[PDB]
Amino acid sequence: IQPNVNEYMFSNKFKARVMVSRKAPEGVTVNDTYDHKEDILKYEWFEFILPEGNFSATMTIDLMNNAIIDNYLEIGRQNGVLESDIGVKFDTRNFRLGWDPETKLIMPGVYTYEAFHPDIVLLPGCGVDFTESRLSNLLGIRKRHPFQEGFKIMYEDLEGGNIPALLDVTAYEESLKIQPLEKDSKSRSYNVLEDKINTAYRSWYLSYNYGNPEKGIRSWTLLTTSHVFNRFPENQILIRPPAPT
C-alpha cells in the first residue's frame, strides 16, 4: 500500500516559528540586578521533517512535538532559550475545563487531561505554517475557505484563546488565598501574564470554541475530525497530551 506519512503525499513536513535566542541587550553584564524582562527575544522559521510511516494520529502529534524539541536542543537552549520559552506545542485537551467564573482560574490546579481534539498551543512570537503541509488535515484543522491561499495560524491570530492559569492549590489549602500558579516543579515558569488570571500560552481549540465567533480564528478555520515524548512530565502545559482511548 502506502504509508500515512510519506514525502510523496507531503505529510511529513510542516513549518513553524520558534524562539531562537535570549540575550541581554548590549553589554548589560547580567548580574543579580538584572530584571530579565528586558531580554531580546529573536524568533525564526524552520521546516520540520518527521520520519515516514503510518504513525496513527496521536503518534503523529508525538512526532510533531519531538521535531519542535529537537530544534530547541540544537540551537534553542544554546543561545539562552529556556524550557519556559518553547512556543509550538501540539496538544489534544481542552485547557478551559477547570475554569471558574468567580475566580477565573482553574480550581483543580491541573488541566483536565482528557483528549478532545488535536490542538495547537503557542507562545507570543510563534506560529505554525501548514501552507506546504498536509498534516493540518490530519490534525482536523482545515481552512474554512478552500481557496484561501496559505494556512498560517500564528499567535496573534488566536485572540481570546489564552490558557487560564492554574490555581496554587497548595496555598489555597493553606487557609482564602486564591493565587495563580507561577511556576511548576523544577521551577520553570508557567508565564502568568501579569493579570494573574491567564497564561501567555494561546490554544487554537480555545480561540475556536471560547473566542469571539467573528474576528477570531473560527472566522477562517474549521474544526474537522482527525520518556522521550514526555520530556516535561511535571509541566502541565508541556506534558504529553492524552490519547483518545
Author numbering: 7 to 181, 195 to 245, 283 to 301
Give the article text.
The crown domain comprises two highly flexible regions, called variable loop (VL) and arginine-glycine-aspartic acid (RGD) motif-containing loop.
In the zinc-free ADDobody crystal form, twenty ADDobody monomers are found in the asymmetric unit. Of note, five ADDobody monomers formed a penton in the crystal reminiscent of the ring-like arrangement in pentons formed by the PBP in the ADDomer. Two such penton rings in the zinc-free triclinic crystal form a barrel-like decamer where the VL and RGD loops are outward facing and accessible. Specifically, D106 forms a charge-charge interaction with R83. A cation-V interaction is formed between F153 and R140 of an adjacent chain, and F16 could also interact with F153 of the neighboring ADDobody polypeptide chain.
